[PDB]
Design an enzyme around this catalytic site. Structure first.
Site, PDB file in Angstrom:
ATOM      1  N   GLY A 188       3.440   1.087  11.184  1.00  0.00           N
ATOM      2  CA  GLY A 188       2.227   1.140  11.605  1.00  0.00           C
ATOM      3  C   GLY A 188       1.774   2.728  11.280  1.00  0.00           C
ATOM      4  O   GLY A 188       1.643   2.535   9.579  1.00  0.00           O
ATOM      5  N   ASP A 204      16.677   6.102   1.873  1.00  0.00           N
ATOM      6  CA  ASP A 204      15.396   6.028   1.324  1.00  0.00           C
ATOM      7  C   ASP A 204      14.910   7.384   0.583  1.00  0.00           C
ATOM      8  O   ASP A 204      13.584   7.598   0.978  1.00  0.00           O
ATOM      9  CB  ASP A 204      14.266   5.409   2.649  1.00  0.00           C
ATOM     10  CG  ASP A 204      12.960   5.019   1.932  1.00  0.00           C
ATOM     11  OD1 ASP A 204      12.816   4.698   0.687  1.00  0.00           O
ATOM     12  OD2 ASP A 204      12.057   4.625   2.807  1.00  0.00           O
TER      13      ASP A 204
END
Ligand SMILES: N[C@H]1CCCC[C@H]1Nc1cc2nc[nH]c(=O)c2c(Nc2cccc3cc[nH]c23)n1
EC number: 2.7.10.2
Length: 262
Positions: A20, A124
């Protein structure tokens, strides 16, 4: 956990991801400026898993979670890093000194040394996931892909950020702290390249082919030989012979102190 009445969100979004948006807000603790991940079933579980990782971590170089709030959407409220992602910051501030870059990348190595000691894998690690509190204080963020390693294993077995992934991640789907060290080498290259994207103009498959040939990205312009040598060491093919974060942080620490002496 958190009280929605005590949170005031800004309409503008700082950034976005499949999750989001990231928005700035203020939380009544004194008032605390915060960065909030706002969700846009699997996504809820992913955000709660991210919150669960951050709850377990306590280090000056890792972004802190304030709490979670279930309101108009699920929200993960975290400390605000005012200067934003490191890659964007360096693209916009091309005169940051080599000494300052070393200071920041050393701070990330201190946070990653703590993560390795804690037996969490980030998965990541990239310059977009290092945020600046100030021009001299970096924190690791974005724990959405992170995993707590099992008590009996030193790796986690799994769209992927291929350009930051070690060969054993691509070939065997195995993620360890040494796999994060490979990503840290790519992050170093990005930092000394002022936030340029790694492996410019190449497909993920071409990068895998390049690495398999023993080829590596070259030394960024103005990057100290010692720092390039360290990036190359992070990019050791065989996971077994690649250094861990204790060794990486020590090399960066000693080099930073050498530079500071002048
Ligand atoms: N990796 C970043 C960029 C890619 C999408 C995701 C986005 N993620 C996050 C996570 C964060 N976690 C905790 N605190 C944060 O401040 C924060 C954060 N701040 C942030 C992002 C972008 C611009 C600005 C300008 C000021 N602050 C910014 N961005």
């Amino acid at each position: 956990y958190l009280d929605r009445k005590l949170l005031t969100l800004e309409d503008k979004e700082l950034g976005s991801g499949n999750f989001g948006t990231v928005k700035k807000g203020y939380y009544q603790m004194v008032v605390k400026t915060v960065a909030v991940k706002i969700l846009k079933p699997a996504l809820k579980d992913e955000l709660l898993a991210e919150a669960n990782v951050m709850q377990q971590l306590d280090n000056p170089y890792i972004v802190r979670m304030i709490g979670i709030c279930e309101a108009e959407s699920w929200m993960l409220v975290m400390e605000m890093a005012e200067l934003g992602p490191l890659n964007k910051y360096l693209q916009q501030n091309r005169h940051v000194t080599d000494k300052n870059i070393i200071e920041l990348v050393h701070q990330v190595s201190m946070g990653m040394k703590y993560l390795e000691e804690s037996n969490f894998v980030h998965r990541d690690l990239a310059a977009r996931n290092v945020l600046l509190v100030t021009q001299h204080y970096a924190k690791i963020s974005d724990f959405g892909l992170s995993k707590a390693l099992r008590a009996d294993e030193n790796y986690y077995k799994a769209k992927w950020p291929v350009k930051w992934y070690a060969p054993e991640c691509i070939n065997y789907y195995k993620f360890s702290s040494k796999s994060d060290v490979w990503s840290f080498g790519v992050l170093m290259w990005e930092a000394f390249s002022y936030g340029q994207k790694p492996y410019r103009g190449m497909k993920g498959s071409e990068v895998t082919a390049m690495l398999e040939k023993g080829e590596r990205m070259g030394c960024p312009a103005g990057c100290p030989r010692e720092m390039y040598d360290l990036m190359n060491l992070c990019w050791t093919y065989d996971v077994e012979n690649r250094p861990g974060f204790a060794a990486v942080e020590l090399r960066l620490r000693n080099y930073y102190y050498d530079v500071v002496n002048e």
